[PDB]
From Swiss-Prot, chains A, B:
It is linked to Immunodeficiency 98 with autoinflammation, X-linked: An X-linked disorder characterized by onset of recurrent infections associated with lymphoproliferation and autoinflammation in the first decade of life. Mostly males are affected; carrier females may have mild symptoms. Features include mouth ulcers, fever, poor early growth, hepatosplenomegaly, lymphadenopathy, polyarthritis, and non-infectious enteritis. One of its GO terms (biological process) is toll-like receptor 8 signaling pathway. This is Toll-like receptor 8. Residues 703-748 form the LRRCT domain. Glycans are attached at residues 11, 49, 57, 72, 117, 204, 242, 250, 315, 319, 352, 373, 442, 477, 513, 521, 571, 611, 683. Changing residue 305 to A: Abolishes responses to both ssRNA and chemical ligands. Keywords: Disease variant, Disulfide bond, Endosome, Glycoprotein, Immunity, Inflammatory response, Innate immunity, Leucine-rich repeat, Membrane, Receptor, Repeat, Signal, Transmembrane, Transmembrane helix, Ubl conjugation. Changing residue 474 to A: Abolishes activation of NF-kappa-B. GO terms for cellular component: endolysosome membrane; endoplasmic reticulum membrane; endosome membrane; external side of plasma membrane; Golgi membrane; plasma membrane. The chain holds residues 32 to 817 of 1041 of the full protein.
Length: 748, 748
């Protein structure tokens, strides 16, 4: 669109995406209309006053991860960009803060460099700075120096709201912090003592992160240095006195054995309290601090286990009943054998508690009926226990994953129960009695070997999304699951166990019984043989995932029984036939795929040939995905066979000719993917649709191009249609002639 | 060696391997010294009198699978090959038996063609034939005709010993069979009735296969047509009267409900009796026929279950106690809930019974102590049941797999117990009491989540090979397995369950405790973090499989703890580091790999660079395997860094230059693999070792070669060293110049 950069005029403003394009310099061709410039992930080793001459409306520049193999920045290189507000210089191996940065700046990131010198000369004049990131310059077993913070360097930054200094060796909270601060990150900074003076004047603070100071190092997944004797962090009883607005407090991995309730005396708006990786089993049981937390919404007490201990029960203070605003409680990694109804009484009147997380506790037994007696649990998270039948992203949390506990597609339906990664290897007749009205149920990876027979889920009959992936279900009864009459989504992925055995029964008849089944995933089941009924049928099903089965055997030329296997899926729009070892598809089998299809995937098979003519029988087909096969040839008469195709994905095949004509009157085609094929060239005509083109994406990288003078018309075409995104254009590489043998088009 | 063919002068005789070389004709360059010629798997569409002009010492020709896309053979094409004994013409889409075949023939195979016409004109003069294969010409839902066998066609073949007509539509045993027959195959031939006359004169017969006539079709994994009403095959009571020498009788899938004991009256040397896929639950219980089988060594009664039945116990006739020669009993697929000691009393005095196979019965409970009371069980096969804590190869068996029940590497150690693919999800304290002295134990795929602690295998303390693959073991105790003091082979593959979780313990210390541990497989465990001890140690271990773990994280530049992870494996010769997502290996980590290594695999990683200089620290290194990485460059000074390397595998990398010099003084190098790289050319010098070369294999296929006149010296070199196998030479393909763009070298 603006080589070597794209642009988006989106919408008030103008972004030049010049990312990951192995540039060796800032390109001088950037349009002076651009406001934001992304130069990240290139090979840039120098920035000078020449670099942005040039581009006086620039308000943001992202130089992260250059050269991605440090970056050498001249004094005052940016100094004449009057409008520059945001400057990202992460992971550039910088040995110092660049000198002569512009006073315009409001955001500066210097995360993941080699800076151990924070000087007034560097930053004290940047008086418009709001956010300053200096995290991850010295940590673990990196070779590096303690951070030298010149006294009062930050004091003149009277607009500073965010300061991040985590993952650096500091030893003390810096003094003379501006009272504008709202968020102060000091994790893993080797700070053993927090004095009364350290945060005294910071009355605007809403976040304080002191995690990983005096860390808990047992079983640490990184190089970990504890305080002497694995001692607790030492926090003066008044250290938080003035922090009246505090909303987030992270004390994870500070080796706490005791929580000074007084810490929260003046902090009545605290909403999120993170106490993972301490030694708090005692405090969880007794727990004065728990009376001081009236507005607390999220409490994380995960991984406080005593090593080698495996108590029968979890011991929860009555004082949990004081957590009236609590929405989510995380108690992973306490480690205990049995959860009884009594043990959680202090939680049962908390009006807003919607999520309980007891993952990873090695729990053997649960009194399931206790959950009903909560006021309004929405998410009951029991994944990764022992229940049986009745390297680091600097912009992420370091102590826990932040992905939803339950997939949003499943939780959307209603109350959720996650029993994955346990040992519920069959479901007895009372397994789900006394539960709430579960809508979303996860029994993935229970090595369940049951003959489901239409009774097993009768006590939670309203499940709508059921995840049964990674079990070993035995399909010997045609009434399986049929008691779930409102079932919409059924994941049977990775249940190959019994499908792989010819000699036992495989009954999938049950599929047809559901009036509202929409999405079925039969992936990675190794299905090659069925009992009695060879046809799948449903008046409702939208999407069928059949990848990683054996259609190569089901559609074997000497066997006619499966030739209409999917035809009875009369509503189907989406079908995934990937990874079925197919070398060809019998024409009759293809013509019996449902005519309702809008999306068909046959990627990662071994197809030599595709019968294009048969697309005439699929007038609703919008996406066809044939990536990763062995195809040599495309039809020259595509518009004779489809008027509907919008996306055609043909990467990783053996296509050496692209017929002039291919284009013709195709019109619906938005997205054509020809990357990773055997293409020496591309003719003009092969694109120039004499109707209207919807062409907006055309992929070509990984073809052995030839950059003889003509050209082709291709380059001319490219400019004739600057609005056709062609990603990875730098990866479209002349393999010839030899004056180009590793060059990107174009350059003459 | 003899383009386009190899040759082996091995040893009295001379084999020309011209297989799978996409030939379009029989090459006229075959040396008249050749005795056996393999032309299988090519694109040959014609055979004429010209084809073997030429080659008068030919005794064997294999033309199977031509053209592999039928084959058109002229009358008498082979007629002048006086010494021709064996002719394989399988899978050639032949519409008839070729005419004018030579009388010299002793073996003729015509399996998998379109022959429905067996005529005197075709074969009656082939009076030297011993073995005649005509199987698989008409079967399943192939479009084909009933087989017309001209009356008395076989009668003149008075040397015929083997006749195979299986998988053809016959309806009746052919009459006028020669009394020379020893083996008669008639499986799946649509023969409903066996009369007294059918085998009357066949006194030399030792094998008769009548399987799949009136088949059991429930749950059939192929198109199956039963006799009317699913009726039994009808075998006249005297049909086997004269078959006194019979050794093998296959009656699998003949819908038998009743076994006429009289069938075996005159057949006292029967050794193998196959009765799979019938309806014999009644006969197994009552069983007169069982008294008639004194020399029987293998009995197969698998898959006789009654559909939908799930009896509590298996019912075995007392008459099994008459099977005095029995060595192996196969009772898969009976389907029953519990095996009690009583139920197998009739087996317990059989002196030679070494294998009991009860796979695939969905058994829930076993009285394990019953096995001890057998005389000398060697293999106790219980795989694929429900036990819980206390398309078709025409040359293979069609009704069961013929691979060993136990891997020979494990069974070699002694008595074997296979409990794989059950639900023994923990091992209680008495689980293995009252067993024989087990040496080989398979607990693979029991979803076992146990903390092994050094007591669990105490009642079978002599296990030497333990297969624990595909479980979810929790390594929380450093004494795991240590009670097995003689343990030699330990397979922990596919136990990623708990390794993937950072926050729980992973203790592999136990490895060091074993005095005789030789082979350890830790593949596909996703190992990225260990507890307390970061080093693996053993004075004995020979082989460590560490593929599919996360060495990319273990050897992260900011973490020093795993930099000597394998160093303490002081005896190690073989190490597999494949599939660990490695982009580079820190030099220190490489130099700390044990100096004892003779074989190192680092294939299927993402390496851009390899430090060749560090091979100086591995003076015993014989094999180095770097396939499937991103390497661009080879060292020009290999002999400076190793004098030991014998095999170097470098396929699927990005190597475009092969330094002249690479060769130099390398001498130990037998096998060089450069296939699937980016090589435009290969210089002469790059090979011509001025010391002695051990070069015997050099792979090059899948490189973009250039076939400009010079040449190189390469082609000259090739002939200068005709004894260097270069497999897939036809796949070494000129990508240039354009007069060659898809040609194989060489051709000018
Ligand atoms: C078995 O198949 C189902 C159906 O394909 C899989 O769930 C589906 O996963 C896709 C791929 O992630 C989800 O699509 C994504 O949704 C997000 C959020 O809306 C969107 O941002 C992405 O661009 C993408 O569209 C799809 O919603 C989801 N469907 C359902 C019903 O949950 C499932 O993951 C497969 N199971 C396994 C074990 O592979
Ligand atoms: C875990 O690793 C072990 C050790 O590599 C695997 O067993 C080993 O498998 C190899 C590959 O098949 C066996 O080598 C083969 O032996 C046969 C018969 O002697 C030979 O003909 C072949 O050319 C080849 O050498 C090797 O014997 C065997 N080792 C042992 C101790 O059994 C094992 O399969 C791996 N487990 C999984 C689940 O992948
Ligand atoms: C059911 O639980 C399983 C296991 O906890 C979930 O599987 C994980 O899904 C996440 C998010 O997609 C993946 O990144 C993980 O790799 C999966 N983990 C494993 C162990 O397979 C699954 O998503 C849960 N189902 C629902 C509906 O929430
Ligand atoms: C333990 O049992 C497992 C399962 O029966 C065996 O695994 C099979 O091994 C065969 C022969 O290598 C493979 O072709 C199969 O794919 C494997 N099956 C499965 C389900 O994984 C294993 O070989 C047995 N171990 C020993 C020592 O005999
Ligand atoms: O089955 C169990 C039970 C308890 N623990 C404990 O859980 C903690 C984390 O692994 C350790 O202290 C360990 O003793 C386990 O690891 N596995
Ligand atoms: O768990 C069980 C028990 C029995 N069967 C029976 O085994 C035979 C083969 O699948 C069928 O008759 C079926 O009823 C099973 O499939 N699963
Ligand atoms: C950059 O600075 C040099 C002097 O060091 C000057 O000669 C040159 O014109 C400057 N370039 C721009 C674009 O200002
Ligand atoms: C940085 O670059 C300048 C010129 O662009 C050069 O003179 C200087 O040596 C470089 N500094 C470092 C520390 O590499
Ligand atoms: C710190 O930076 C200052 C100010 O730019 C510089 O003068 C000094 O040399 C630096 N000191 C160290 C130790 O890097
Ligand atoms: C607190 O914050 C605001 C800006 O959000 C600032 O203007 C005000 O002066 C601050 N007060 C103190 C005491 O720092
Ligand atoms: C399925 O199981 C139910 C419950 O045991 C049983 O009653 C029914 O007969 C079974 N078979 C079929 C085909 O539905
Ligand atoms: C058919 O599929 C569509 C999506 O294409 C879905 O909206 C509708 O609910 C399904 N129809 C039926 C009858 O279930
Ligand atoms: C495509 O299939 C049609 C109908 O099955 C058939 O007539 C035609 O020959 C096939 N085309 C190719 C190119 O094989
Ligand atoms: C093959 O037969 C033809 C006659 O059909 C004859 O002219 C020719 O010489 C023969 N070739 C050989 C090698 O015998
Ligand atoms: C077989 O080949 C001969 C000549 O080589 C040709 O004349 C004849 O038509 C072919 N026969 C068939 C059935 O294709
Ligand atoms: C069978 O082969 C004979 C002898 O070669 C031939 O004459 C006849 O045409 C063939 N009959 C059929 C039905 O193919
Ligand atoms: C049986 O077999 C031998 C060859 O093995 C043959 O010579 C002998 O004549 C045969 N006897 C009969 C009765 O066919
Ligand atoms: C391992 O388990 C055994 C048996 O319970 C126990 O006695 C021992 O103390 C455990 N721990 C270690 C480190 O061996
Ligand atoms: C060391 O390895 C070899 C194979 O290299 C093996 O023969 C020997 O038993 C092992 N040594 C010890 C001490 O276990
Ligand atoms: C190979 O490693 C050695 C020793 O660690 C080091 O001196 C040398 O620079 C490395 N070689 C390359 C080519 O990086």
């Amino acid at each position: 669109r603006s080589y070597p950069c794209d642009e988006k005029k989106q919408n008030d403003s103008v972004i030049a995406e010049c990312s990951n394009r192995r540039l060796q310099e800032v390109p001088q061709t950037v349009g002076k209309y651009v406001t934001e410039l992304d130069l990240s992930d290139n090979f840039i080793t120098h920035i000078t006053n020449e670099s942005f001459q040039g581009l006086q409306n620039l308000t943001k520049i992202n130089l992260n991860h250059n050269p991605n193999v440090g970056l050498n920045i001249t004094d005052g290189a940016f100094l004449n960009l009057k409008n520059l507000r945001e400057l990202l210089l992460e992971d550039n191996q910088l040995p110092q803060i660049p000198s002569g940065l512009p006073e315009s700046l409001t955001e500066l990131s210097l995360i993941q460099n080699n800076i151990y010198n924070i000087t007034k000369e560097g930053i004290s004049r940047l008086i418009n700075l709001k956010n300053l990131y200096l995290a991850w310059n010295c940590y673990f077993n990196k070779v590096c120096e303690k951070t030298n913070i010149e006294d009062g360097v930050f004091e003149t930054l009277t607009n500073l709201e965010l300061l991040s200094l985590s993952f650096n060796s500091l030893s003390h909270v810096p003094p003379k912090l501006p009272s504008s601060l709202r968020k102060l990150f000091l994790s893993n900074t080797q700070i053993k003592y927090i004095s009364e003076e350290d945060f005294k004047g910071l009355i605007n603070l809403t976040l304080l992160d002191l995690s990983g100071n005096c860390p808990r190092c047992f079983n640490a997944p990184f190089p970990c240095v504890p305080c002497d004797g694995g001692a607790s962090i030492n926090i003066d009883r008044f250290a938080f006195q003035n922090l009246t607005q505090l909303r987030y407090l992270n004390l994870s991995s500070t080796s706490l054995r005791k929580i000074n309730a007084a810490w929260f005396k003046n902090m009545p708006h605290l909403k999120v309290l993170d106490l993972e990786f301490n030694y708090l089993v005692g405090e969880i049981a007794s727990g004065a601090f728990l009376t001081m937390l009236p507005r607390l919404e999220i409490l994380d007490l995960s991984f406080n286990y005593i090593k080698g201990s495996y108590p029968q029960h979890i011991n929860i203070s009555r004082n949990f009943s004081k957590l009236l605003s609590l929405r989510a409680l995380h108690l992973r990694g306490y480690v205990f054998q049995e959860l009884r109804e009594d043990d959680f009484q202090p939680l049962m009147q908390l009006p807003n508690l919607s999520t309980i997380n007891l993952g990873i506790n090695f729990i053997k037994q649960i009194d399931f009926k206790l959950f009903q007696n909560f006021s309004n649990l929405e998410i009951i998270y029991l994944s990764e226990n022992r229940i049986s039948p009745l390297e680091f992203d600097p912009h992420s949390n370091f102590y826990h994953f932040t992905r939803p506990l339950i997939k949003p597609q499943c939780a959307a339906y209603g109350k959720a129960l996650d029993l994955s990664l346990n040992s519920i290897f069959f479901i007895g007749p009372n397994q789900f009695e006394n539960l709430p009205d579960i809508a979303c149920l996860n029994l993935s990876a229970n090595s369940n070997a049951q003959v489901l027979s239409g009774t097993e889920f009768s006590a939670i009959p309203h499940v709508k999304y059921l995840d049964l992936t990674n079990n070993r279900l035995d399909f010997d009864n045609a009434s399986a699951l049929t008691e779930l009459s409102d079932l919409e989504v059924l994941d049977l992925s990775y249940n190959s166990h019994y499908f792989r055995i010819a000699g036992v029964t495989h009954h999938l008849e049950f599929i047809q019984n559901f009036t509202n089944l929409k999405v079925l995933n039969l992936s990675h089941n190794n299905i090659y043989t069925l009992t009695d009924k060879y046809n799948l049928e449903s008046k409702s099903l939208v999407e069928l995932v059949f990848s990683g089965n054996r259609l190569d055997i089901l559609w074997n030329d000497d066997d006619n029984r499966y030739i209409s296997i999917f035809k009875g899926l009369k509503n189907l729009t989406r079908l995934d036939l990937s990874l079925n070892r197919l070398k060809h598809i019998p024409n009759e089998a293809f013509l019996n795929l449902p005519a309702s299809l809008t999306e068909l995937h046959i990627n990662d098979n071994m197809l030599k040939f595709f019968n294009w003519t048969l697309l005439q029988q699929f007038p609703r087909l919008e996406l066809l995905d044939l990536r990763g096969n062995k195809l040599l040839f495309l039809t020259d008469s595509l518009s004779d066979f489809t008027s509907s195709l919008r996306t055609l994905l043909l990467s990783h095949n053996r296509i050496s000719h692209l017929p002039s004509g291919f284009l013709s009157e195709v019109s619906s085609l938005k997205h054509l993917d020809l990357s990773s094929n055997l293409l020496k060239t591309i003719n003009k005509s092969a694109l120039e649709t004499k109707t209207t083109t919807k062409l907006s994406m055309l992929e070509l990288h990984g073809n052995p191009f030839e950059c003889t003078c003509d050209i082709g018309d291709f380059r001319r075409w490219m400019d004739e249609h600057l609005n056709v995104k062609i990603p990875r254009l730098v990866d479209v590489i002349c393999a010839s002639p030899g004056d180009q043998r590793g060059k990107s088009i174009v350059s003459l």
